[PDB]
Amino acid sequence: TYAIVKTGGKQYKVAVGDVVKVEKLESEQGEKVSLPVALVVDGATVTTDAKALAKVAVTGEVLGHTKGPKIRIHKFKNKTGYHKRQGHRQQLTVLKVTGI
Amino acid sequence: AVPKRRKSRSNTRSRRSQWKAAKTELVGVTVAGHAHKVPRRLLKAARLGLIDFD
Amino acid sequence: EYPSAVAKARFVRVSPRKARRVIDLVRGRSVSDALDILRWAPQAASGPVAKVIASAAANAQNNGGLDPATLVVATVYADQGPTAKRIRPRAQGRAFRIRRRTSHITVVVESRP
Amino acid sequence: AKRGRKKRDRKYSKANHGKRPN
Amino acid sequence: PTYAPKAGDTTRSWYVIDATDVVLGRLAVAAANLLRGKHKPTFAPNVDGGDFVIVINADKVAISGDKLQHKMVYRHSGYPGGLHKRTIGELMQRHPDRVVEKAILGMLPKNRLSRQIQRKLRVYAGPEHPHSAQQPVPYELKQVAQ
Amino acid sequence: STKTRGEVSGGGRKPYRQKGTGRARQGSTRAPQFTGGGVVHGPKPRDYSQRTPKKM
Amino acid sequence: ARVKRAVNAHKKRRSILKASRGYRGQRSRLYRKAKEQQLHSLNYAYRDRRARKGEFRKLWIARINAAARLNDITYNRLIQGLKAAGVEVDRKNLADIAISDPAAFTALVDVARAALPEDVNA
RNA sequence: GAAAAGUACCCCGGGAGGGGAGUGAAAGAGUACCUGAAACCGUGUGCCUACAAUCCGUCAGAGCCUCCUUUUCCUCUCCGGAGGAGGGUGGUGAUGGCGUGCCUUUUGAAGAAUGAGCCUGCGAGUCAGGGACAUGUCGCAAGGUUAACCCGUGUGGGGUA
RNA sequence: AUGCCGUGGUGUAAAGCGUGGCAGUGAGACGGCGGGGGAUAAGCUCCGUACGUCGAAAGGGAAACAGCCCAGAUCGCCGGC
RNA sequence: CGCGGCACAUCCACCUUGUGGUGGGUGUGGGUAGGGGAGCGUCCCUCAUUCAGCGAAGCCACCGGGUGACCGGUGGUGGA
Ligand SMILES: [Mg+2]
Ligand SMILES: [Mg+2]
Ligand SMILES: [Mg+2]
Ligand SMILES: [Mg+2]
Ligand SMILES: [Mg+2]
Ligand SMILES: [Mg+2]
Ligand SMILES: [Mg+2]
Ligand SMILES: [Mg+2]
Ligand SMILES: [Mg+2]
Ligand SMILES: [Mg+2]
Ligand SMILES: [Mg+2]
Ligand SMILES: [Mg+2]
Ligand SMILES: [Mg+2]
Ligand SMILES: [Mg+2]
Ligand SMILES: [Mg+2]
Ligand SMILES: [Mg+2]
Ligand SMILES: [Mg+2]
Ligand SMILES: [Mg+2]
Ligand SMILES: [Mg+2]
Ligand SMILES: [Mg+2]
Ligand SMILES: [Mg+2]
Ligand SMILES: [Mg+2]
Ligand SMILES: [Mg+2]
Ligand SMILES: [Mg+2]
Ligand SMILES: [Mg+2]
Ligand SMILES: [Mg+2]
Ligand SMILES: [Mg+2]
Ligand SMILES: [Mg+2]
Ligand SMILES: [Mg+2]
Ligand SMILES: [Mg+2]
Ligand SMILES: [Mg+2]
Ligand SMILES: [Mg+2]
Ligand SMILES: [Mg+2]
Ligand SMILES: [Mg+2]
Ligand SMILES: [Mg+2]
Ligand SMILES: [Mg+2]
Ligand SMILES: [Mg+2]
Ligand SMILES: [Mg+2]
Ligand SMILES: [Mg+2]
Ligand SMILES: [Mg+2]
Ligand SMILES: [Mg+2]
Ligand SMILES: [Mg+2]
Ligand SMILES: [Mg+2]
Ligand SMILES: [Mg+2]
Ligand SMILES: [Mg+2]
Ligand SMILES: [Mg+2]
Fold first, then answer.
1. Could you list the residue range(s) of the whole structural domain that residue G19 is in?
2. Distance between CA atoms of C46 and C26, rounded to whole angstroms?
3. Region (Disordered) spans which residues (chain E) (predicted)?
């Protein structure tokens, strides 16, 4: 069985025992989270329905807070003398799936 | 005419690698009991003793 | 890996490209089969290269106590030496530069069955 | 003549709405 | 991460398309789609998926009379004034398969993959092909009602 | 202290003709872009000292 | 206080030449050429970090079209019908399903077809 | 190099140069000598490349090679890891999309307008003055302040013009 | 018809006005609408226009394509309209 | 539009309740000439403190870090 779970504005296809990198969640390490789902496949069924799916919630565990890859930015235009350097590191949260 | 641009490393090296020495082939000769190797065109001279093996 | 000996010839008054042309003739060969190749090569740089190869073989046989019939030219290359600069007068008060290049020739022979 | 005519007549497309520079 | 086909995942098959009364454009689109493999959900633009296509009866393709008379084929040899010129009529008389395959090849992407994709196409004027050992399934053209 | 292009030794005349050589225009051999030439806005002997009021 | 420039000046040069590894020709050996190539490269990466979001949607839509037409429905009407049925799965996961679980994709197509209106031209 | 202790002796070589010994803490200090960058030139090696139209990169991406690790196995296992399956570094990049160098100067330059072969070093708003204007800040305040000069080893104390 | 001046209500943060410090600019281009010169020619030329864009604006469309249509890039996302 | 990070200005409440910070809303954040604000790196001097022949500077490689100029750790080479 596997489910399509929504978090951070994006959706992930997960199964029990999977690790996922989602957007940062305001939760420490080791405690439990509950997330809404958009589709549950238990074999042949899909459950395909908001009324039923509003009762199903995947249960997760926070494994820690990692960072994304470092993004180097250097904006440049042809003959102006214009440059603008900028860096970025995205904050994430690693999730272990234990529910469905 | 003058070169408009300097050639890249790859283009210089392609033409430069084709400048090479041709290797001549050597055959065995036994003169005065000793064995040597000379180019095949010098066999007569080697047998008559006109070749100086240094 | 294998027992080996080294010889060098530094500040040899031969252009590095002209030395490499004849070094490519003997790279990888046995010492006996390279000495005669260099003997019969018509190029001028074949003299100094042969001298260095012979010296390396002598070092292997004497200093290392190896067998001459087992020696093979493992690595050989020609690096650049210092370059002297001269002047050739040309037409209409022009003065062009002439480069006298030298080479460093390095040979490593090794004994292997 | 052809170059100018055909350049000027390509403003009559849906994406340009009847106008182009020059 | 979205799925990307690996070397050895692609599975080919053999199709035979009969050109008895199909018009040239319809047949060319169908053949190009089969060759590229766009009908496979495992499609990837940088991978040569898709199948082998055998086209038979290339002389029966439906070409309009005015097209036979007036559609013209141009080749330049590279020499001054070296623009040579045939009609679809003359081509259909002489090398009918070339018309079909030229129409098909015009519809493929213009890159290095299409050079390898076009290697899977076989066009024959007669009703019989030599690839009987391979067992090509017949393929009729469908349109999905919307 | 340093030397300006006016105080560096020599360098009075124009090194060569303005046009027809294919070289840059130079004007003097002691111009600051030359090796061995003058210094632009270089240090000069100064008097660092302030008039702080007696009350302060 | 006379200051030699070398110690401070090489800091940016080392970073440029270190980021320019793998370029062929002068663009990995010479600092002035590597600097221009780095300008171009970082602009390209900025542009592509925003273009790939549409690129992947393009790919997913292509694969969904293939799977839908295999199950005898256009991508067009499949999307209309899924929205009508109130299914909120996104295209990334629809394409993932089409690759992995074709039976589930067929079930989804049945749901979309059922929810689609009886006459689609009214 | 602290000191010449500047490589006796042997070997290849006409020599030059080198190898072995030896001095030295160090020859990764050998009179071409402190450190020893870059351009530039080799040699070896991993991947790619001889049907393809490339501002030379970027995003997607298979496959190889390398080194670490979770599995089922050589359980020889104290072994160590051969291999298998997964994962991760690092190198390479078959293939797909996108993509008109930098500077100056211009209404407008990828421009077939200017400048630049490359690397290294150097190369351009500074200083003077109880100057002028305006501001930030500190001292004193209906007052504020000294100039020359005098006395002090000084950066301190006097000095009302 | 529009535009312009005044006035009373309502709305709108980054409007306006006075006074100082520091400027740059004073070669514009095309497109829409109204005109002069020109042959009611010009990618022509000279004016008007609380008109636009470029200049100094990247992204999408127009095959390519400063000035046309859509739309103004704070960074990230393998989300959606 | 969604979810996350940053910054400017302003409104609403506290801590010195604008020297400046703390919490939440709201608006804003393309840019040439040009104006304003805040910073990085190099060298020299003074004061305090701390490393260095058990190895400083400089240079090289690798692994990391910051919104930027840039920084750190480890190893190698080196010798004040
Ligand atoms: Mg400009
Ligand atoms: Mg003369
Ligand atoms: Mg003078
Ligand atoms: Mg003069
Ligand atoms: Mg001098
Ligand atoms: Mg001087
Ligand atoms: Mg006094
Ligand atoms: Mg590469
Ligand atoms: Mg988008
Ligand atoms: Mg000793
Ligand atoms: Mg030492
Ligand atoms: Mg030393
Ligand atoms: Mg030297
Ligand atoms: Mg040295
Ligand atoms: Mg090939
Ligand atoms: Mg082309
Ligand atoms: Mg490419
Ligand atoms: Mg293109
Ligand atoms: Mg002009
Ligand atoms: Mg040019
Ligand atoms: Mg050009
Ligand atoms: Mg021009
Ligand atoms: Mg010119
Ligand atoms: Mg000019
Ligand atoms: Mg030039
Ligand atoms: Mg000053
Ligand atoms: Mg004051
Ligand atoms: Mg003002
Ligand atoms: Mg004027
Ligand atoms: Mg004017
Ligand atoms: Mg008009
Ligand atoms: Mg007129
Ligand atoms: Mg005009
Ligand atoms: Mg004009
Ligand atoms: Mg106008
Ligand atoms: Mg301008
Ligand atoms: Mg634009
Ligand atoms: Mg504007
Ligand atoms: Mg555009
Ligand atoms: Mg904006
Ligand atoms: Mg801005
Ligand atoms: Mg500016
Ligand atoms: Mg010691
Ligand atoms: Mg120092
Ligand atoms: Mg260190
Ligand atoms: Mg060190």
1. 1-122
2. 10
3. 127-146
Chains A and B are in contact, defined as 3 or more C-beta pairs closer than 8 angstroms: no
Domain holding C1, by residue range, is: 1-113
Q: How far apart are CA A64 and CA A28, in angstroms?
A: 7
Compute the CA torsion angle B35, B39, B41, B45 (nearest 10 deg): -40
Tell me, in Å, the resolution of the deposited structure. 2.7
Closest C-alpha among B18, B35, B15, B17 to residue B27 = B35
The whole-angstrom separation of Cα C4 and Cα A75 is 57
Tell me the CATH number at C61: 3.90.470.10
Split into its structural domains, chain G has a count of 1
User: Which one-letter amino acid corresponds to residue G78?
Assistant: L
Query: CA(E112)–C1'(H53) in Å?
Result: 12
Task: Find and list the nucleotides of strand I having atoms within 7 Å of a protein beta carbon.
Answer: 30-32, 43, 56-57, 59-64, 66-69, 73-81
CA distance G35 to A70: 20
Give how far Cα F23 sits from Cα of C90, E31, E125, F15, Å.
20, 67, 74, 11
CA distance G79 to chain A (A): 15
* N-terminal to C-terminal alpha carbon distance within chain F: 33
3-class SS shares of chain D: helix, strand, coil, % to 5: 45, 0, 55
Amino acid (1-letter code) at residue E17 = I
C-alpha pair distances (Å), E56 with each of C92, D17, E27, E63, E121 = 79, 47, 11, 16, 11
Q: Do the beta carbons of residue A39 and residue G87 sit within 8 Å?
A: yes
In chain E, which residues have their Cβ closer than 8 Å to the Cβ of G74?
Answer: 144, 146
In the structure, do chain E and chain B come into contact, i.e. share 3 or more CB pairs under 8 Å?
no
